[PDB]
Amino acid sequence: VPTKMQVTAPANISASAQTFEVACDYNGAIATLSDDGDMVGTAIVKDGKAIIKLNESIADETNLTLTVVGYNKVTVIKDVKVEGKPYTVAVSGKTITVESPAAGLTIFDMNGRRVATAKNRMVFEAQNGVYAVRIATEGKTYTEKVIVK
Secondary structure, eight states: OOBOOOEEOOSEEETTOSEEEEEESSTTOEEEEEETTEEEEEEEOBTTEEEEEOSSOOTTOSEEEEEEEOTTBOOEEEEEEEEOOOOEEEEETTEEEEEEEEEEEEEEOTTSOEEEEEEEEEEEEOOSEEEEEEEEETTEEEEEEEEEO
């Protein structure tokens, strides 16, 4: 029968984060952040903590799952909120056009850095790579992920 381990982690993570710290009383447990499969970073617990280095930007996510697994331990799972229909996000060559009347718009580069903020509409002049767009309306934030060639 497996035993329990203690796990403490934040309930929220910045859209711009590069790391996520997990405390755990079982050294050698593995703590992983994921979006429905897509594993976005993993670290082993050493000296009571795992410092997860993200392997990609999570700015295109509104939630992530934290899972901590240990040998003969009960797995621990926690939901983590990521914080930065009625919109469009358009790509044309190196431009990204975002439109959503009354909404806060933000774009993040592939390192998670916030590169643009505007209300209602913006055209962003991008470079080759992958961007996240977050569209914050009253009640709800939507996201899209954009490839610029």
